[PDB]
Design a protein around this ligand. Structure first.
Ligand SMILES: O=C(O)c1cccs1
Ligand SMILES: O=C(O)c1cccs1
Ligand SMILES: O=C(O)c1cccs1
Ligand SMILES: O=C(O)c1cccs1
Lengths: 518, 519
């Protein structure tokens, strides 16, 4: 792969790539479509619009939007102007967003109508710097000074040239959370998505122009950003976008060509989703679908899920691992080489190391902490020097995963170096779930660990000590957690216990909980 | 009143004052009591204990505690050490505390057991700097880094000398909410509570050594911090503290001598509480209480409430106004000169100005914006230069209130400059409540305004447009707010309407709602 030039604007790169195919569909959702020419026009009008309201090069904007055709316009339009979009999860709380507004110093917000209420609450509570709120598909009347995204774009002529950025200039942020503390601002450059799109999208997956890409993983997830924006636009593929929650039925409707007159050829999702679809009574048959490639990431793929999928569809699931910090997948199975029970082989262009308790070598077949050296790594966590130092160890990025290397050079997942759980693509802190449980007045103490479900997939499991003299039912506890946590975070079961295993200092021995002591 | 000396430590001042009465009760609550000598010992031991865990002069600690005897030990022990306690409301959310930990850079937290769950959530999610958590009356097993408050105090000998602070050095913080944006860290000096306690506690209320003080307003409130800490310690009075919510029965129990073998002589609380008490069937008779003085602040007092209290008790309610920023009351009725319908007269030592649209003066009988010049003003809002320069303008502090001066020199409340609601003593933003209601999936739009209840006291009232094809209930939405915000921010009723009145700009015509056009 040839490196990108030193003067490089990622948005202009993707627009230029597709000037050969102006009338091919770039993006389609339930209600709209953009050809590559339409996307280019709207991208550059948006870029002009942000500049016209006073947003300057290198300033951030918050991009808080459901998957739909306006999403890439927002993302690429900011980048075309040399403005840094901060693309965030759509299922967070107003407090989460208020922290992000302050921390990013966002100068504007691009937000879906459905998300305006949570955004409004974040604006009201925070010491933000937001100059304008631009609302895609408003679901309620606009407040004074807010503007509809379509009018905002339509009112400005296209910016005539992109910002003259460098390849190693910040281009966009994602946020990633650890087991405690506020989300961390992962800063990616203009070069980083070129690298993931070339090394993985083109050279590992072999995506091509006649593909139709559809990702259950949303655009704000590193995984989804690649799958359904950077990868397809790199090769000229058409992309299907879906705003709603990805259930089996929602996915199957698109698989069957229910939207935009297109059937996906490439699908991407989490192992949990694949398990859910294989369980579904109305799982489509091989002849109803046009899938040629199924990608998975976000948690280890249990072998039985890949084997079942292969037996039913005659397609393997290609399981890989990436991170927010590395932007996309650096260790993967290949379309024509899949070894179930492993995450495959290092992606060419990425170097992988396993380190022991002192940073030393580990013998094949022994677990080590996984570190990655490759060209898509983020530069830092913005404004967090101590966490940056821990993660970005001079050229090597520490994943937080443990792995074992096998005789054939493949790698098998061996757990985490923190206490995070990966519950269907999404990191979940057990300490967060515990913090929520102990605010129920009937709970004295709580401990949350990961447990494998009937398919081998990790879900939280809560051990709760009830407070003497209060009552507390399991149904009571379910209701309590329902609107306080997002559903992926729901414990799969709660066990009421008389006490928890602890050291003399009162630290909970969570390892004893995973070992079954209760 | 003599100014304090340049070298001045407020805690040391209060301890020194009471070296003449070591065995008199300083503080008593439902389970414990402290004489002045025992308070001094505990205060200085706590001071040493904070130093021993590495907290330095000028660093903050969060004080998140229910009213009881440990509260003044925590507050004065920090100040004795030259450490700055940040005294906060006990009814807030985890998100609320997360922000205060971050913004204060608190190095330790002193917390009541009952508030440990909410603090734990705040510590988990925040980028805080807390090294140790000291837990007063733990209600669950201690975690690593946590220590029982009595064990912590008991583990250290008294600090020999207080920190050598200056009168104008920061001594403590309180947080003040605004209509939008984060709550503001109000910085008070060592001198500030000396001035309030001399100018108001002694010289206006005439508190004396033989009083027993009892405030329904908790210690974290600027009002209660004077009432039940700085005021009584200044004169050697005994103070009754209560952890629980101040309902009429709880208050009456204490008025009657149900706790500590002491009947309060001096009561303090919001007009809301006085209305609740006067409406109560079990309201005590005169001959059952020892009350000699009844103070009110936190909202304007309806004349009818003071008049009924006086008819029943032969005591007036003495209404005054203070602010977090001015630390205590600067405009007040006097114990023997009360004019109901007014907040009385300037407190000697404070100058008061009303200013109209141009910054100029206003005629008597017309409203103006209230500004105060007095010696207890906070210095700034920590880390907020813009709001500091807007509030603290060369010796004048802007209250955000409007008032009218009457012909007799008394002052009558005329509303706010910023749409804040003052609900039972607590400033509440209607915009916070609204932005929260709109997250309800059945709500299309919502506006919240302040409406008088049946006693004339302002409560939030919500006007909601439901989403077409949804039916909502009042109580559902009360719950929805209690589950997300501090609980007393809940709208007392919700009116469901088809549309909100708006300007041509799409701005909500809040004045129409408040004026009752839609009911
Ligand atoms: O495995 C994962 O979580 C990811 C794959 C690509 C970006 S993140
Ligand atoms: O399938 C999904 O929704 C996801 C996989 C990785 C992040 S989200
Ligand atoms: O609860 C009360 O009575 C009050 C709190 C603050 C002023 S009065
Ligand atoms: O009136 C009030 O809110 C206050 C009285 C003394 C401090 S604050």
């Amino acid at each position: 792969v040839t490196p990108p030039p030193e003067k490089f604007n990622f948005a202009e790169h993707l627009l230029q790539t597709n000037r050969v195919r102006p009338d091919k569909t770039a993006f389609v959702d339930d209600i709209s479509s953009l050809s590559f020419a339409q996307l280019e026009a709207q991208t550059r009008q948006l870029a002009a619009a942000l500049r016209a309201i006073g947003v300057k090069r290198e300033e951030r904007v918050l991009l808080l939007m459901l998957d739909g055709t306006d999403w890439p316009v927002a993302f690429l339009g900011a980048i075309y102007a040399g403005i840094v979009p901060v693309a965030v999860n759509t299922l967070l709380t107003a407090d989460d967003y208020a922290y992000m507004l302050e921390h990013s110093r966002a100068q504007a917000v691009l937000v879906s109508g459905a998300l305006h209420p949570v955004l409004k609450a974040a604006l009201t509570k925070s010491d933000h710097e937001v100059q304008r709120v631009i609302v895609s598909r408003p679901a309620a009347p606009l407040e004074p000074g807010e503007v509809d995204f379509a009018e905002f774009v339509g009112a400005h002529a296209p910016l005539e040239k992109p910002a003259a950025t460098q390849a190693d200039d910040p281009a966009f942020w994602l946020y990633s959370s650890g087991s405690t503390g506020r989300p961390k601002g992962v800063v990616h450059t203009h070069a980083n998505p070129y690298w993931t799109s070339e090394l993985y999208g083109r050279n590992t997956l072999h995506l091509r122009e006649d593909d139709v890409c559809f990702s259950a993983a949303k655009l704000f997830f590193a995984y989804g950003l690649g799958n359904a924006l950077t990868f397809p636009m790199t090769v000229g593929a058409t992309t299907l976008l879906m705003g709603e929650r990805p259930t089996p039925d929602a996915v199957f409707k698109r698989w069957l060509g229910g939207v935009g007159g297109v059937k996906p050829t490439v699908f991407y999702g989490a192992p949990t989703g694949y398990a859910g679809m294989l369980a579904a009574p109305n799982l489509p048959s091989r002849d109803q679908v046009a899938l040629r490639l199924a990608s998975s990431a976000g948690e280890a793929l249990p072998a039985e899920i890949g084997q079942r999928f292969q037996r039913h569809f005659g397609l393997d699931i290609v399981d890989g691992i990436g991170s927010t910090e590395m932007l996309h997948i650096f260790l993967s199975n290949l379309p024509d080489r899949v070894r179930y029970g492993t995450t495959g082989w290092p992606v060419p262009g990425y170097q992988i190391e396993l380190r022991g308790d002192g940073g030393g070598p580990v013998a094949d077949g022994e677990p080590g902490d996984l570190y990655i050296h490759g060209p898509s790594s983020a530069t830092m966590y913005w404004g967090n020097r101590a966490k940056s130092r821990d993660t970005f160890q001079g050229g090597w990025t520490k994943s937080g995963d443990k792995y074992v290397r096998n005789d054939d050079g493949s790698y098998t997942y061996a757990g985490r170096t923190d206490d995070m759980l990966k519950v269907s693509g999404i990191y979940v802190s057990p300490f967060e779930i515990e913090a929520t449980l102990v605010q129920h007045p009937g709970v004295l103490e709580a401990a949350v660990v990961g447990v494998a479900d009937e398919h081998g997939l990790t879900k939280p499991k809560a051990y709760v000590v009830p407070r003497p003299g209060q009552t507390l039912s399991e149904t009571e506890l379910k209701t309590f957690i329902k609107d306080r946590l997002a559903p992926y975070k729901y414990p799969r079961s709660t066990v009421f216990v008389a006490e928890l295993p602890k050291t003399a200092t009162g630290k909970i021995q969570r390892f004893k909980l995973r070992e079954g002591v209760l």
